[PDB]
């Protein structure tokens, strides 16, 4: 997990404004969640061939579809996999008002076929420490909510929850982690999309997009579900299902 | 339906700032949606003894609870009914990105016991015309997201969708209706709460709270699921279940 067959290329432009375009296929866990009609409404991350992790506030149902291996949403020519969802597992501690514990697992009806462009992100262990100031990466097609149709990426630093509260106040709970406010927007992250940090040569899922600045401010950090606080629930869910 | 045993009293103060406190029990279809722990996160409306209608973006589950007959959330002394949810029916056309078709039905495990303070709002027919400029009423505990603990009410006019787009642009779809921008906030409406209009002596559910001004501006209208566009789905769901 966490080792893309096509290595990402992150330049200085990933750190400013709205980030930059990713190398095609270099974020191979990145999936698109689409409705029956093919409308993209959220992101997610493959954690193995049968399971995708996304945000609970995406409200995914078994009539939505996971699309893996995508780079250009405007293309009908690239190799993609449209994967049916068998069952949706929303974390029972999710609260649609506070948006805390904002995580949902999707079990696919049939396994994805992993490849150079389709593979899994690593999960952290509950006890991993991702220190404030660590540079991490968010990817997605979130800029299409407001514009490039190809997958974007931005590099941005984790904040301490204390410093995040200077921006978002009592909205920030222990099961959340913030990143950004460093001169780049977080808006390229789709709801439910990944925030990944590289430790020991492997990209690890540290956050899941919950919400960000309503104006995509370069000085307001994004807010993410804190995966270390939720990975025990993830592993219990996989083991029981 | 739509005829409260305790008649509402709406004064001029319902039309300005943040509205006014309701007469206790005078909005008897108004329910509170709470999690297992008793935390209020959304509103809804009883449409009979077995069914509550709310917003799809509330993400209600069968472990949440419907609380009927409530006036003061800070009181443990008033007669309320805590009702378990048997099954949740989210409209399959709901889209968590656009927030269109934002309606969910809750079927209760055991019927509410209707009374002077607990009874049903009327549903419109699909073909009813609620003209722009009609004065309607939104009720709820939505101000507690930011403060009074008792049920509030505000009187505010429906907008045409064309005029609503002057505020919210392409966010406004045919299955939405807007109200407000007349000198009063819409923020007293909980997510999923009622927007009711009085025709022929009966209060009718015209809207369900979808979203409003992030700053509770008195000059920005609230956005509601348009019940006339969704009532056929409501009646099909009741008939099939």
Swiss-Prot record, chains A, B:
All copies of domain Peptidase S1, residue ranges: 16-239
GO cellular component annotations of the record: extracellular region; serine protease inhibitor complex
GO biological process: digestion; proteolysis
Keyword tags: Digestion, Disulfide bond, Hydrolase, Protease, Secreted, Serine protease, Zymogen
E.C. no: 3.4.21.1
CDD domains in the record: Tryp_SPc
Keyword Protein biosynthesis: no
Propeptide residue intervals: 14-15
Secreted in keyword set: yes
Annotated InterPro entries: Peptidase_S1_PA (IPR009003), Peptidase_S1_PA_chymotrypsin (IPR043504), Peptidase_S1A (IPR001314), Trypsin_dom (IPR001254), TRYPSIN_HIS (IPR018114), TRYPSIN_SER (IPR033116)
Compartment(s): Secreted, Extracellular space
GO molecular function: serine-type endopeptidase activity; serpin family protein binding
Recorded catalytic activity of this chain's protein: Preferential cleavage: Tyr-|-Xaa, Trp-|-Xaa, Phe-|-Xaa, Leu-|-Xaa
Disulfide pairings: 1-122, 42-58, 136-197, 164-178, 187-216
PROSITE patterns: TRYPSIN_DOM (PS50240), TRYPSIN_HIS (PS00134), TRYPSIN_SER (PS00135)
Active site residues according to the UniProt entry: 57, 102, 191
Pfam family, one: Trypsin
PANTHER family: CHYMOTRYPSIN-LIKE PROTEASE CTRL-1 (PTHR24250:SF66), CHYMOTRYPSIN-RELATED (PTHR24250)
Family: Belongs to the peptidase S1 family.
Name by which UniProt lists this protein: Chymotrypsinogen A
């Amino acid at each position: 997990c966490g080792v893309p067959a096509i290595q990402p290329v992150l330049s200085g432009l990933s750190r400013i404004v709205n980030g930059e375009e990713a190398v095609p296929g270099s974020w191979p866990w990145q999936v698109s969640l689409q409705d029956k009609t093919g409308f993209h409404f959220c992101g997610g991350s493959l954690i193995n061939e049968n399971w995708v992790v996304t945000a609970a506030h995406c409200g995914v149902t078994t009539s939505d579809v996971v699309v893996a291996g995508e780079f250009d949403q405007g293309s009908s020519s690239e190799k993609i996999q449209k994967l049916k969802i068998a069952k949706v597992f929303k974390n029972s501690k999710y609260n649609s008002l506070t948006i805390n514990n904002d995580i949902t697992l999707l079990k696919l009806s049939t396994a994805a076929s992993f490849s150079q462009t389709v593979s899994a992100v690593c999960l952290p262990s509950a006890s991993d420490d991702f220190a404030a100031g660590t540079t991490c990466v968010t990817t997605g097609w979130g800029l299409t909510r407001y514009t490039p149709d190809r997958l974007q990426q931005a590099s941005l630093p984790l904040l301490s929850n204390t410093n995040c509260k200077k921006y978002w106040g009592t909205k920030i709970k222990d099961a959340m982690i913030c990143a950004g406010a460093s001169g780049v927007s977080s808006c390229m992250g789709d709801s439910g999309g990944p925030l990944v940090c590289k430790k020991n040569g492997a990209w690890t899922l540290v956050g899941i997009v919950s919400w960000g600045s309503s104006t995509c401010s370069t000085s307001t950090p994004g807010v993410y579900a804190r995966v270390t606080a939720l990975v025990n629930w993830v592993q219990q869910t996989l083991a029981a299902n």
